Design a protein around this ligand. Sequence first.
Ligand SMILES: *[C@@H]1O[C@H](CO)[C@@H](O[C@@H]2O[C@H](CO)[C@@H](O)[C@H](O)[C@H]2NC(C)=O)[C@H](O)[C@H]1NC(C)=O
Ligand SMILES: *[C@@H]1O[C@H](CO)[C@@H](O[C@@H]2O[C@H](CO)[C@@H](O)[C@H](O)[C@H]2NC(C)=O)[C@H](O)[C@H]1NC(C)=O
Ligand SMILES: *[C@@H]1O[C@H](CO)[C@@H](O[C@@H]2O[C@H](CO)[C@@H](O)[C@H](O)[C@H]2NC(C)=O)[C@H](O)[C@H]1NC(C)=O
Ligand SMILES: *[C@@H]1O[C@H](CO)[C@@H](O[C@@H]2O[C@H](CO)[C@@H](O)[C@H](O)[C@H]2NC(C)=O)[C@H](O)[C@H]1NC(C)=O
Ligand SMILES: CC(C)CCC[C@@H](C)[C@H]1CC[C@H]2[C@@H]3CC=C4C[C@@H](O)CC[C@]4(C)[C@H]3CC[C@]12C
Ligand SMILES: CC(C)CCC[C@@H](C)[C@H]1CC[C@H]2[C@@H]3CC=C4C[C@@H](O)CC[C@]4(C)[C@H]3CC[C@]12C
Ligand SMILES: CC(C)CCC[C@@H](C)[C@H]1CC[C@H]2[C@@H]3CC=C4C[C@@H](O)CC[C@]4(C)[C@H]3CC[C@]12C
Ligand SMILES: CC(C)CCC[C@@H](C)[C@H]1CC[C@H]2[C@@H]3CC=C4C[C@@H](O)CC[C@]4(C)[C@H]3CC[C@]12C
Ligand SMILES: CC(C)CCC[C@@H](C)[C@H]1CC[C@H]2[C@@H]3CC=C4C[C@@H](O)CC[C@]4(C)[C@H]3CC[C@]12C
Ligand SMILES: CC(C)CCC[C@@H](C)[C@H]1CC[C@H]2[C@@H]3CC=C4C[C@@H](O)CC[C@]4(C)[C@H]3CC[C@]12C
Ligand SMILES: CC(C)CCC[C@@H](C)[C@H]1CC[C@H]2[C@@H]3CC=C4C[C@@H](O)CC[C@]4(C)[C@H]3CC[C@]12C
Ligand SMILES: CC(C)CCC[C@@H](C)[C@H]1CC[C@H]2[C@@H]3CC=C4C[C@@H](O)CC[C@]4(C)[C@H]3CC[C@]12C
Ligand SMILES: *[C@@H]1O[C@H](CO)[C@@H](O)[C@H](O)[C@H]1NC(C)=O
Ligand SMILES: *[C@@H]1O[C@H](CO)[C@@H](O)[C@H](O)[C@H]1NC(C)=O
Ligand SMILES: *[C@@H]1O[C@H](CO)[C@@H](O)[C@H](O)[C@H]1NC(C)=O
Ligand SMILES: *[C@@H]1O[C@H](CO)[C@@H](O)[C@H](O)[C@H]1NC(C)=O
Ligand SMILES: [Zn+2]
Ligand SMILES: [Zn+2]
Lengths: 636, 636
Amino acid sequence: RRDPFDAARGADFDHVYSGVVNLSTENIYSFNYTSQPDQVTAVRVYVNSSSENLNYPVLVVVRQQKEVLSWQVPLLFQGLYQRSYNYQEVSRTLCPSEATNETGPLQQLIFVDVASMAPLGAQYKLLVTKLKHFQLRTNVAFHFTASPSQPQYFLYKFPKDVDSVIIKVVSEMAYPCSVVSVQNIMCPVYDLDHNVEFNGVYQSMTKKAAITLQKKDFPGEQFFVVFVIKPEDYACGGSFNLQRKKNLEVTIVPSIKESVYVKSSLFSVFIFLSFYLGCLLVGFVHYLRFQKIYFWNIITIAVFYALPVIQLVITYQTVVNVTGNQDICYYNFLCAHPLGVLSAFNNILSNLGHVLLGFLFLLIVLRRDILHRRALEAKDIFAVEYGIPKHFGLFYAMGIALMMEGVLSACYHVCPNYSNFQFDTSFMYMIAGLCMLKLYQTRHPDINASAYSAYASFAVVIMVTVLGVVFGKNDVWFWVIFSAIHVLASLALSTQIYYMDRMVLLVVGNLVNWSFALFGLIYRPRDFASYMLGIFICNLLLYLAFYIIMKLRSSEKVLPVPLFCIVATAVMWAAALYFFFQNLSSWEGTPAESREKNRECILLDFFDDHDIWHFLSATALFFSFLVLLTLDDDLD
Amino acid sequence: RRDPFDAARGADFDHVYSGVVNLSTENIYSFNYTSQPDQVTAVRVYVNSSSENLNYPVLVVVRQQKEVLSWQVPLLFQGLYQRSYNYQEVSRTLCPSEATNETGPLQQLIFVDVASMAPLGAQYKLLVTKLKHFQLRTNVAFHFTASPSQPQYFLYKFPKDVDSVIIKVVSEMAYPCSVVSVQNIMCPVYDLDHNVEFNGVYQSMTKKAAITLQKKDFPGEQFFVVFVIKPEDYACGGSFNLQRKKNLEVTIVPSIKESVYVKSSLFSVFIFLSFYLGCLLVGFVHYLRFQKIYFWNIITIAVFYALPVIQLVITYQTVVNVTGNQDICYYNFLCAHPLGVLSAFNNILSNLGHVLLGFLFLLIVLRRDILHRRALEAKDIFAVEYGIPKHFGLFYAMGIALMMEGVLSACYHVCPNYSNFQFDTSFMYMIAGLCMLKLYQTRHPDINASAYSAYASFAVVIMVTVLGVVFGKNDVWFWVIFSAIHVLASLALSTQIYYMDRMVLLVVGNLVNWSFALFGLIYRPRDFASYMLGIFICNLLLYLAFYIIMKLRSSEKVLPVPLFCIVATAVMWAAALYFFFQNLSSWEGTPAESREKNRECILLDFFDDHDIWHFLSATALFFSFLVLLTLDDDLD
Ligand SMILES: *[C@@H]1O[C@H](CO)[C@@H](O[C@@H]2O[C@H](CO)[C@@H](O)[C@H](O)[C@H]2NC(C)=O)[C@H](O)[C@H]1NC(C)=O
Ligand SMILES: *[C@@H]1O[C@H](CO)[C@@H](O[C@@H]2O[C@H](CO)[C@@H](O)[C@H](O)[C@H]2NC(C)=O)[C@H](O)[C@H]1NC(C)=O
Ligand SMILES: *[C@@H]1O[C@H](CO)[C@@H](O[C@@H]2O[C@H](CO)[C@@H](O)[C@H](O)[C@H]2NC(C)=O)[C@H](O)[C@H]1NC(C)=O
Ligand SMILES: *[C@@H]1O[C@H](CO)[C@@H](O[C@@H]2O[C@H](CO)[C@@H](O)[C@H](O)[C@H]2NC(C)=O)[C@H](O)[C@H]1NC(C)=O
Ligand SMILES: CC(C)CCC[C@@H](C)[C@H]1CC[C@H]2[C@@H]3CC=C4C[C@@H](O)CC[C@]4(C)[C@H]3CC[C@]12C
Ligand SMILES: CC(C)CCC[C@@H](C)[C@H]1CC[C@H]2[C@@H]3CC=C4C[C@@H](O)CC[C@]4(C)[C@H]3CC[C@]12C
Ligand SMILES: CC(C)CCC[C@@H](C)[C@H]1CC[C@H]2[C@@H]3CC=C4C[C@@H](O)CC[C@]4(C)[C@H]3CC[C@]12C
Ligand SMILES: CC(C)CCC[C@@H](C)[C@H]1CC[C@H]2[C@@H]3CC=C4C[C@@H](O)CC[C@]4(C)[C@H]3CC[C@]12C
Ligand SMILES: CC(C)CCC[C@@H](C)[C@H]1CC[C@H]2[C@@H]3CC=C4C[C@@H](O)CC[C@]4(C)[C@H]3CC[C@]12C
Ligand SMILES: CC(C)CCC[C@@H](C)[C@H]1CC[C@H]2[C@@H]3CC=C4C[C@@H](O)CC[C@]4(C)[C@H]3CC[C@]12C
Ligand SMILES: CC(C)CCC[C@@H](C)[C@H]1CC[C@H]2[C@@H]3CC=C4C[C@@H](O)CC[C@]4(C)[C@H]3CC[C@]12C
Ligand SMILES: CC(C)CCC[C@@H](C)[C@H]1CC[C@H]2[C@@H]3CC=C4C[C@@H](O)CC[C@]4(C)[C@H]3CC[C@]12C
Ligand SMILES: *[C@@H]1O[C@H](CO)[C@@H](O)[C@H](O)[C@H]1NC(C)=O
Ligand SMILES: *[C@@H]1O[C@H](CO)[C@@H](O)[C@H](O)[C@H]1NC(C)=O
Ligand SMILES: *[C@@H]1O[C@H](CO)[C@@H](O)[C@H](O)[C@H]1NC(C)=O
Ligand SMILES: *[C@@H]1O[C@H](CO)[C@@H](O)[C@H](O)[C@H]1NC(C)=O
Ligand SMILES: [Zn+2]
Ligand SMILES: [Zn+2]
């Protein structure tokens, strides 16, 4: 029978052994070592076959007390479209074994067998090294490299007090993909291409990655972090001595404390309770000085838009929570602080304004309407010769639209996905439509088109946006059709509005023409919903400015409050647009690329660009509504 | 250096070799054979270690020309909640290699090394066999067994003419879960728990599995079918010498031809064009004898309900088509014949009735209304003393509702899922509500409650169904509240309708209480939408019967047409209810259990139970609408 010790070459690490193997010869090495308490050892084996022989690859086997590994040196990889890759270098890190005080020091023996089947002979170069850069320390950076045939991994231990940590991985060149996984301390460790996704959370990456971990999940308060390269780049983006070495840097930082949650929530509540305080103060000062269809329509639409997306987000959140695959939701992982089951608490709590400001506007408008109704009950002719008809439903509809938009944005931000590009700014389409209708009706007679012209316009707009995003991704015929339809609609609107100021239609048409030229040259927004939002905002602002200039030309004085409101609306729009243009993550594109553009929070230690965008959108909409309501106070 | 031949024990298959291994002793066998053209050989290795030694397992390494395998005898499996299992027998199949005529006969060697590290020694029994039942033949069954540590797989080759095949796997005891995968002929083959899902299509199963495969995808027209058992049953259902042998039977059958498609399409079209032909002939015979809000409401609701579901289903279908994981959509896999990109073409084409019947009903109602308007233009006092008010909006609303329900059902059936449990029969809620409203308006005066009473009722009903299904899965308080609310609603409806026939209110209340007791003693429908449909159908039929019997008590003769329509409606309703009670697949429950109840098609070789339910529902609803419209002909 075979004797290992007899033929075993008592060897030592760090020595570059060389040899040649025939059909009737096997080489065996018998490395030995010891492990002491409080320290972790991780041997690593490198094998390079200088020869390129492929019909008789070298076979390598590693044996320990309780594990066996085996592979080939000329590693062969198969890729789509019948492509073959051959790597002539291989490496592997053996699973470590802890040594406690009770166990004491432990002696370990490792057998390495190299054998081939080539009739003539195959060369091989073997190397074995200990690892000193194995453990990881919080807040301390680290650099290394990996390859398709050289997967890597390291260990981390949980400090005494830290209850949550964040692992951030950064590269420079995103040519080949990579996969980063986290696993418990239980050998074996699946650091291979086809089994790295079996266990533990994992993330695809090309230039950035971030993973948040708790402490109660892991027994023993330790875990292994595994990095694996991929032979091909199809999954992450474009197409695909052969090597693909990738340089990586990994950092681990403790997470924030609940004090951040308390401070952020209190600040968010009070910053917008201040508006109610100011409104009550102004009402008190004024009192001292003095000393229908929309309702059911909006309720039905709210339920219709709420139930389906709400169930969808519930299911998606549950699935991502259970499976542990962080590639379904298009979060911004750099700043996404979870609470309970919720994974992104900030992006939802940053929606308080879209509700509070809307409810305040509802309250103020209702009070004004009730006061006017009581005054009319008392009767006064001053509002006939020196007054104009008053309407109420439009403002309530605007406010309820604002509340529903806030709730829709929250539900959408629960878990972003490519199937939810709308529901984020859909109701601001209605808000702009209501503003346009209010402006049309205030000047010209009522001539109400009931209420369903706006609903038809909204449905058509949504249909066009969805069809363009789903199908007009790479086509241009649909783009030409949409451009022609937009130009025709603009011309028709100008003609209808027209019937000293004869050049206003020309100005608006020329602006829109510059717009078509702009994106015809650009011809690649790739986000139809964002443009629809922008164009509706443009039209709203242009029409408001035109009406204000017309009123000024009419030789009347604007009350100071509407003037201040208009200026505040302009500045708030400026800030909100600045924050909106900032892009963090995007549903379009592979999840590897979407995370590539992330940022590490601004303002407090909680919020980022999108939250400030929510805040500015809410406040700017509130002030625009106030401008619309209070502009014509001087007429009475 | 070590010498394999010097220590090689030239062995033979089918002999149970026995041995004992120490730290310094490892045994090696050198099996040898030859493969001839037109035959496939697949060795198989069984290793059993009698001892239970866990600290010092026996390590086995198998070496071939171009591959290396390795494992331990006492295989260890880790399961959730910190559970450990050990299996003392292992088996494996070595990847075969074809031998072409040009290549000629090929000699092959296989080295099996058994080595351990126990200080004293461990026993081992080794068996190596050839495989004769490796290839699979079309339409021929096959029986075998698998174990968590003994995965299996076989080869299949595409016949000359077969262009698509179906693989069906059947078991008897659903205790241990299983996975069935299909892969291309390119070694290695992933038949392990942690890497079986990496490549090729696959399906989880407990009692039944079915997979459909084309020909152009596979180069060489061959593929491997791999069956792998799982240590625990958490994924596919409930909770978890040790052994979990599972017996399986496999069948492979060629798929249908396009003539089936042509036959099914022609039959589906002409069965429902027959109704138009018959109506035209009836009108011909009659001629020879003679010789607004709803529109906008429904158009808005159409887009409002459709766009999100359409986009979601498009994304789901694309992802399932590309990724190849057949566990997202809850199809009925046994009879799902795909066309182009669509995966279940039959379940979509089976909705033609919901549109054709609706269109015919709208045409007929419009014709009748137009001739009535012409007659009124000519004027006739007969329809005053012996006439009743005539309305038109409700019938068009019903027709449009049917036409929209057809598209909603099609969109839902594109890919059923737990997030689309509605949209399969949701619009028929409104259908029943509008039928109820029409009946109420017919006898009593107009007293129109506009149209939004039904809108609010539908929104509230959908909200209740959603919150019950998503939340009320396991709770009883919500069920008690719902029962109380429904009893109160029944009492209120009875009181309102009441103000010879003094006992009908008691009868309806008692029927409601009987349903109460039924679902309070069963306490397990677990399908809120289904019971909502049942209850709407029940009250609709009850009111129809009450009205018809009251009309009978009024001493007037009904025209033969209403009698024929009522009888046909009753019969079609019974048939549709029967076909509805049949259960094929279900979104609730794991995908393994959903497929456990599937059936192999009825009628032609295309359609099955659910399609028949669609047909019957369409026809029965059309006849019910006709009954309502033509019931009161005798009055004039
Ligand atoms: C085995 O490997 C050796 C290369 O080291 C070669 O065989 C050797 O041949 C020389 C010259 O005849 C002998 O002196 C050695 O004793 C042989 N050693 C062995 C291990 O065979 C050859 O490359 C391989 N064997 C064959 C048959 O090719
Ligand atoms: C296999 O090939 C690689 C690369 O050709 C060898 O890696 C070299 O290692 C030395 C050691 O410092 C470096 O100076 C060289 O720069 C490395 N090569 C390259 C291309 O950078 C490796 O030594 C060879 N053998 C083994 C067993 O890995
Ligand atoms: C090696 O296996 C054998 C069990 O068969 C044991 O060692 C044997 O001991 C006897 C008595 O001294 C010798 O005659 C044999 O030559 C030994 N065989 C070998 C292979 O060493 C023992 O279980 C194992 N070795 C040790 C050191 O325990
Ligand atoms: C390992 O153990 C298994 C059972 O634990 C042995 O399998 C037996 O195989 C024979 C061969 O026909 C059957 O008659 C027995 O019924 C099987 N055992 C049982 C419990 O049913 C097997 O022989 C052992 N060794 C190997 C190498 O498999
Ligand atoms: C009523 C209005 C104000 C609510 C608006 C936000 C809604 C959509 C939020 C508030 C609370 C949230 C829920 C809180 C907890 C969980 C449990 C988790 O396992 C699934 C998601 C689920 C069920 C959340 C879904 C989203 C949710 C329902
Ligand atoms: C406009 C909205 C976002 C403003 C905030 C209101 C709602 C959504 C907030 C207020 C209080 C919040 C809850 C507070 C505490 C918990 C318990 C935790 O285990 C799950 C989440 C859950 C249940 C939160 C979900 C979101 C919540 C319901
Ligand atoms: C970001 C992508 C989707 C493109 C959207 C562009 C939008 C947000 C931008 C581009 C052109 C801009 C407009 C250009 C000119 C004017 C006239 C000015 O008197 C009021 C503001 C207004 C109306 C701007 C508002 C913001 C605007 C509409
Ligand atoms: C004409 C009126 C409407 C303008 C008021 C809105 C202002 C604040 C908007 C309009 C266009 C916007 C800019 C568009 C593009 C850029 C370039 C980018 O690298 C930094 C932000 C910056 C500079 C934006 C900041 C905000 C911005 C200046
Ligand atoms: C015109 C009305 C009646 C059509 C009603 C059926 C609808 C839902 C059907 C008709 C055509 C179908 C599409 C045909 C082909 C594909 C390509 C596939 O990669 C994604 C799904 C998609 C895009 C289908 C989605 C469902 C679909 C849109
Ligand atoms: C459910 C009701 C509304 C469907 C009635 C409309 C029929 C004619 C529609 C619905 C879905 C359609 C199919 C959708 C997708 C494809 C795949 C493509 O490669 C060929 C055309 C084909 C096969 C379409 C033919 C027309 C089609 C069958
Ligand atoms: C199938 C699941 C959801 C359970 C519900 C079953 C439903 C559809 C069943 C159970 C009780 C049944 C009703 C029992 C009694 C009557 C009165 C009769 O004059 C007409 C049929 C009618 C109205 C039945 C229609 C079908 C019905 C409503
Ligand atoms: C005509 C109107 C009043 C409907 C009358 C109700 C009839 C048609 C319904 C009520 C209960 C139903 C039965 C309930 C259960 C089963 C068992 C199943 O294995 C076959 C169908 C069968 C036998 C159903 C057939 C249809 C059925 C008999
Ligand atoms: C190395 O020395 C012997 C030789 O294999 C071995 O038995 C022992 O356990 C090892 N001890 C240390 C300290 O490495
Ligand atoms: C082992 O002893 C060292 C001695 O300082 C101590 O620091 C360490 O905490 C001990 N570990 C255990 C597990 O007892
Ligand atoms: C078996 O015989 C020898 C012994 O190993 C081997 O070299 C040869 O290739 C084999 N021949 C056949 C016909 O199996
Ligand atoms: C090999 O020869 C046999 C002889 O009958 C024939 O049937 C088979 O088709 C041939 N195969 C090839 C690939 O030539
Ligand atoms: Zn947002
Ligand atoms: Zn159906």
